[PDB]
Amino acid sequence: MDSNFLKYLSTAPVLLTVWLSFTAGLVIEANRFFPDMLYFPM
Amino acid sequence: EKSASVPFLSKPEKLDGSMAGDVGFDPLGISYFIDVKWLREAELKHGRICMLATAGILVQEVIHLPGPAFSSKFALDAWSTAPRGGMVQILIAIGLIEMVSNRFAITATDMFANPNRKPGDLGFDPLSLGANPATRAKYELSEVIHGRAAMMGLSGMIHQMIVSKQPVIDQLLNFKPVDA
Amino acid sequence: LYKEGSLQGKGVNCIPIFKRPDSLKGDAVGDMGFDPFGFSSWVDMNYVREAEIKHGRIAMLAFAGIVVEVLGIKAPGAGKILGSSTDIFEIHNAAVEKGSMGQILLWCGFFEMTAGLPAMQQMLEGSGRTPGDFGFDPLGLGKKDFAQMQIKEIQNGRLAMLAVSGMVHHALINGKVQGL
Amino acid sequence: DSMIVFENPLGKCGAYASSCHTFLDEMGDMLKATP
Amino acid sequence: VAGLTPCKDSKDFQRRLDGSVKKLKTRLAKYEKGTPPALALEKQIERTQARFERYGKAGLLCGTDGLPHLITDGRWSHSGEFVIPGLFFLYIAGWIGWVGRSYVLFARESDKPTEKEIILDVPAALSFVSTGFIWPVSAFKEFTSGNLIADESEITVSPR
Amino acid sequence: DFSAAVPFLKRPSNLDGTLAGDVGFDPLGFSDVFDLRVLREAELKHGRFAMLAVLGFLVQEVYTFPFFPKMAPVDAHDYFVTQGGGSQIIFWISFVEIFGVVALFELIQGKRDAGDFAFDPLGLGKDEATLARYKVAEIKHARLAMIAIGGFIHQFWVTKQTVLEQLG
Numbered sequence A: 001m002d003s004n005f006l007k008y009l010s011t012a013p014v015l016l017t018v019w020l021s022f023t024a025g026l027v028i029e030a031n032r033f034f035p036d037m038l039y040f041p042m
Numbered sequence B: 001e002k003s004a005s006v007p008f009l010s011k012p013e014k015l016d017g018s019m020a021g022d023v024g025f026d027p028l029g030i031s032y033f034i035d036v037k038w039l040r041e042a043e044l045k046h047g048r049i050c051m052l053a054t055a056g057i058l059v060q061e062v063i064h065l066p067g068p069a070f071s072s073k074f075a076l077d078a079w080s081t082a083p084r085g086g087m088v089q090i091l092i093a094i095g096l097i098e099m100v101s102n103r104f105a106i107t108a109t110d111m112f113a114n115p116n117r118k119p120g121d122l123g124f125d126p127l128s129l130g131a132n133p134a135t136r137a138k139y140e141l142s143e144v145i146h147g148r149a150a151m152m153g154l155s156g157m158i159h160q161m162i163v164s165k166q167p168v169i170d171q172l173l174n175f176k177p178v179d180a
Numbered sequence C: 001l002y003k004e005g006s007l008q009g010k011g012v013n014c015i016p017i018f019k020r021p022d023s024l025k026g027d028a029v030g031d032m033g034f035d036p037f038g039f040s041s042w043v044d045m046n047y048v049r050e051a052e053i054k055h056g057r058i059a060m061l062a063f064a065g066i067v068v069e070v071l072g073i074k075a076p077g078a079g080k081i082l083g084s085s086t087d088i089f090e091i092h093n094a095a096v097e098k099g100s101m102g103q104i105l106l107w108c109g110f111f112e113m114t115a116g117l118p119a120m121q122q123m124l125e126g127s128g129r130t131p132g133d134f135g136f137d138p139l140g141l142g143k144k145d146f147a148q149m150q151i152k153e154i155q156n157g158r159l160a161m162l163a164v165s166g167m168v169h170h171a172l173i174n175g176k177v178q179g180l
Numbered sequence D: 001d002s003m004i005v006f007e008n009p010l011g012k013c014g015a016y017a018s019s020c021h022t023f024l025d026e027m028g029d030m031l032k033a034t035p
Numbered sequence E: 001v002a003g004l005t006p007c008k009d010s011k012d013f014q015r016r017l018d019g020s021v022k023k024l025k026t027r028l029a030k031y032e033k034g035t036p037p038a039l040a041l042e043k044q045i046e047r048t049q050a051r052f053e054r055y056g057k058a059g060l061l062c063g064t065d066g067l068p069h070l071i072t073d074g075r076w077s078h079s080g081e082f083v084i085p086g087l088f089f090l091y092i093a094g095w096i097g098w099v100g101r102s103y104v105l106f107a108r109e110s111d112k113p114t115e116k117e118i119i120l121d122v123p124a125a126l127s128f129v130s131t132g133f134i135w136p137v138s139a140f141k142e143f144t145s146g147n148l149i150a151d152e153s154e155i156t157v158s159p160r
Numbered sequence F: 001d002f003s004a005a006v007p008f009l010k011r012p013s014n015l016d017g018t019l020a021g022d023v024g025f026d027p028l029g030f031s032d033v034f035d036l037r038v039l040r041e042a043e044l045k046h047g048r049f050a051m052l053a054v055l056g057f058l059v060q061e062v063y064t065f066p067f068f069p070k071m072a073p074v075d076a077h078d079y080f081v082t083q084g085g086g087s088q089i090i091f092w093i094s095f096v097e098i099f100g101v102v103a104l105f106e107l108i109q110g111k112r113d114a115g116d117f118a119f120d121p122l123g124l125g126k127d128e129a130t131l132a133r134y135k136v137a138e139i140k141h142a143r144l145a146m147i148a149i150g151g152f153i154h155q156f157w158v159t160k161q162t163v164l165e166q167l168g
């Protein structure tokens, strides 16, 4: 891959968007498979 | 100029062939951005854990420790039936083992601070079987290939057990093709 | 090589349809210029020669066994335990049931692990052992013309491989190994 | 009272042509199957 | 029990469950059986019932309104309500802060720190992300070695 | 200049005849704006898929595996979509195409020849003359099979008849 294209992917807004989309997916899947968790189960 | 494992792709620059099991296999070029020392340490750890995992999945189906808690041929069921306090104890012991074996150098910034620290060399040789230079290279290659094979086997075992809902040996002896 | 240049060696082609690959250098016994796919370029010649000899020997023994089974010649007491069936597949299943084939497997594997594997490894590491050599000449039949015996063994083993394959498939089709 | 438990996995199964339907048995039956 | 009643045996909680299920069933009555709308509404009913049953068994306390209430005082019987979740947060947040600070220093000692801050060096960033898992001992080690807190005479301050 | 294939059309500038099967045919000038190497990789991937698809159609019509229901090649698609075998084939083709992406990037960088994956298991292309003849044959067959597979599928859709049965 072009090093310039990789730097463009490394730019701040692209990384922020990708990381926060990944985090949103993590939270969404956590709530999809383990929903309605108002508490830590003990 | 071309990788041995994948002829049409170029040889990975960071893979110089010094490491055991090096056939120039790095199509995605992880070694370019991740230190090969860290990568090999991770590879050996994964391979060792999966070696033990395959051995355990295959053995604890036939031989168990005494007790209803430990009596479970199905490994995923054993995960739940085994005493939870014992499992947490194993987790804590693994943490302490990591800490002491890595000598407080357990992060990507300090793991290989000591030049003497070599990838995957944690000072573990209780019987001193690795002191023979003639057999050391063969043992290293065997360890790497075993780790790779055990990783693949453990993954296959886990997911075939998810599918069949029966142990590995029990599945192979009473096979029932997947239906929905 | 026995009859070098006529029976085997460089410049010999059993099937002139396919050109003698340059990789076939006429140094190996049984080299009659047949390798259309050019495997000799990449394969390990000693390993593949040892494999050929092993396959040929097993095929020769298998031809003798299948033939004596179809002819109905049985050792004293074999019929009572296994049965009077002449079918090779039925005999195989019955022997597996009784435990004969299991013991044969155990001892063949023991011989492999203790003799063939170490011998093959040493040969491939450069011991200079001739492929397929185990020193098994108690009757001393090979002392007169060892090269002639070698070529005869290789050719007989190849023919026996083809014959055994044909016999098995004939038994599958017609129920007769002759497949007349 | 507290002893290691050895459970025989094989039972009465055989790699082929046995009472239990093994992986090899499945492959064979599929090869000889009729649509 | 503290000042309220367990939610597993509360008429208000049962009434809320009944109301939710009845709303869903009324919505379902107008859809043919086996159609995607009917399946979706049945799954909603199942999810509601599972949520209420799990809340009842969790040991949550419910007030007169019929809704679970949280006892965030330190009581160990209700740790899972605020404390353990709070510990998980603090762990993750300290991870984030520690790795961010490490990357800030790494970029500070570079040829172009501003370039490293707008166009990141993601190999080093991932390195720090990995390091972040023992941030408590690492942060305390930094503090005790004196690399964390700056001296009063080395920080710019406005005139009085 | 004028293309060899089309006397009245000017030879495309990028098409200098070096590549196999290059007869100067590019009326719409895709080579003018797109990388000829990338286009050739796409061409050969398409042609290989199409040739294997034609052979698969014929072999499926004559023979089907004992463990699979017997059916026309086109219907086999919709059947295996639900069965799950189509999912496996798609997944493994995607797995190979993941390395295909790396191969394409290397081609762009100028390390590889378009369509050259160093795949000669039987060593049939060792000598040059034969290799060039084989490359011309490969591109010719690729194009012919790309046409023929579309012909097969559309004819089946029209007649609802396998090609072997239609030919009689």
Ligand code: CLA
Pocket (backbone or CB within 6 Å): C047, C050, C051, C052, C054, C055, C058, C105, C108, C109, C110, C112, C113, C116, C117, C120
């Ligand atoms: C059961 C024991 C056994 C063993 C250990 C071997 C070993 C061997 N055989 Mg085999 N062989 C056996 C039985 C056995 N054979 C039997 C019963 C027959 C029929 C009578 C044959 C017929 C035969 C032929 C015709 C040929 C071989 C060949 C070989 C060699 C190459 C295979 C190899 O190295 O695989 C090792 C494995 C790998 C390299 C990687 C794959 C790993 C797999 C998946 C696991 C292997 C599990 C292991 C075999 C199980 C037993 C373990 C136990 C001994 C501790 C090797 C020396 C070939 C050769 O080149 O010979 C010189 C050959 O041509 N064998």
Ligand code: CLA
Pocket (backbone or CB within 6 Å): E082, E085, E086, E087, E089, E090, E093, E094, E096, E097, E098
């Ligand atoms: C899902 C629930 C949830 C959500 C969405 C948030 C969201 C947020 N919390 Mg968090 N928080 C939660 C649950 C949640 N919290 C719970 C349950 C607790 C109780 C333990 C806290 C306790 C808490 C604190 C104490 C703080 C936040 C802060 C924040 C905000 C900034 C966090 C940040 O920048 O992290 C990225 C991390 C950093 C920038 C590093 C520095 C800050 C972290 C929090 C330090 C952690 C370690 C440190 C040693 C803790 C000392 C605490 C002590 C002084 C009390 C953010 C809006 C921060 C805030 O509002 O700041 C104005 C903040 O300081 N939260």
Ligand SMILES: CC1=C(C#C/C(C)=C/C=C/C(C)=C/C=C/C=C(C)/C=C/C=C(\C)C#CC2=C(C)C[C@@H](O)CC2(C)C)C(C)(C)C[C@H](O)C1
Pocket (backbone or CB within 6 Å): B050, B051, B052, B054, B055, B124, B125, B126, B127, B128, B129, B130, B146, B147, B149, B150, B152, B153, B154, B155, B156, B157, B160, B168, B172
């Ligand atoms: C290092 C060292 C020491 C040591 C040591 C030790 C303890 C070494 C232990 C080594 C071990 C346990 C190695 C295990 C390897 C397992 C493998 C390769 C499994 C592969 C499975 C596969 C391919 C599979 C599969 C399958 C799947 C998935 C599908 C199934 O249907 C079929 C099947 C089952 C076939 C000691 C202590 C001596 C000290 C010394 O001084 C130093």
Ligand SMILES: CC1=C(C#C/C(C)=C/C=C/C(C)=C/C=C/C=C(C)/C=C/C=C(C)/C=C/C2=C(C)CCCC2(C)C)C(C)(C)C[C@H](O)C1
Pocket (backbone or CB within 6 Å): F074, F077, F078, F146, F147, F149, F150, F151, F153
């Ligand atoms: C839809 C669908 C499917 C599908 C599908 C598939 C695989 C569909 C595939 C369709 C294909 C491959 C169509 C090809 C059309 C080719 C044409 C028109 C060529 C014309 C060439 C010409 C005119 C050449 C002319 C020539 C030129 C230029 C130069 C030389 C001279 C001349 C002869 C003039 C399934 C089967 C999976 C079913 C599923 O339910 C979904």
Ligand SMILES: CCCCCCCCCCCCO[C@H]1O[C@H](CO)[C@@H](O[C@H]2O[C@H](CO)[C@@H](O)[C@H](O)[C@H]2O)[C@H](O)[C@H]1O
Pocket (backbone or CB within 6 Å): B084, B085, B086
């Ligand atoms: C040897 C002295 C060491 C002193 C340091 C110990 C510090 C920390 C000890 C923590 C307490 C031990 O943890 C313990 O709690 C679990 C709670 O389910 C126990 O769980 C189980 O334990 C017993 C069997 O061992 C059973 O009779 C209990 O009914 C069962 O709850 C485990 O036995 C153990 O995991």
